[PDB]
Amino acid sequence: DDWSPPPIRMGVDVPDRIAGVAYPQGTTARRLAQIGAVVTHDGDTLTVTPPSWRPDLRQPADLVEEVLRLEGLEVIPSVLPPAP
Amino acid sequence: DDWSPPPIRMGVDVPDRIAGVAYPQGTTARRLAQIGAVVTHDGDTLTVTPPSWRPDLRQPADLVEEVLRLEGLEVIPSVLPPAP
Ligand SMILES: [Mg+2]
Ligand SMILES: [Mg+2]
């Protein structure tokens, strides 16, 4: 009687860290609700339940990709890493 | 009638940073007094007046060399810098 995939816990700033971009406040919750997920917010952790048409959303990295592609890859800066 | 060089202002933890070593508290003040300097404390800043037989002591780096050599170079660790 409920077709939603399991909930996913993710830090609120995790998309920001993976992108290397400080997104405006509330971007991650806004974007993940736009794609149809239920987002509850406790502390610095989001609990994110994907909608039934998104069985591909299973871990934080899946959620990160949603935020980043909607914000657009162009906002991600180009920074060479420090190789040892 | 006073042959001392001019005073030198140096932050108390400057030798530590140049060495890459956290020396026990008071090491710089103790070493600089051993070599004959007059040392006074003002916050994190030392005022160091070299003795008259040390005209080579003119800038903070000269004071750093005094601390590092008496503590011994063996304590300085070996850390490759991240090069860009
Ligand atoms: Mg994906
Ligand atoms: Mg010297």
Swiss-Prot record, chains A, B:
Q: Which residues form the B5 domain?
A: 3-78
Which top-level group of life is the source organism from?
Bacteria
* Cell compartment(s), UniProt: Cytoplasm
What protein family is recorded?
A: Belongs to the phenylalanyl-tRNA synthetase beta subunit family. Type 1 subfamily.
Assembly, in brief, is:
Tetramer of two alpha and two beta subunits.
Q: Note on file? A: Was identified as a high-confidence drug target.
By what name is this protein known? Phenylalanine--tRNA ligase beta subunit
Q: What species does this protein belong to?
A: Mycobacterium tuberculosis (strain ATCC 25618 / H37Rv)
Q: Which gene encodes it?
A: pheT
Give the residues of the full protein shown.
Answer: 412 to 495 of 831
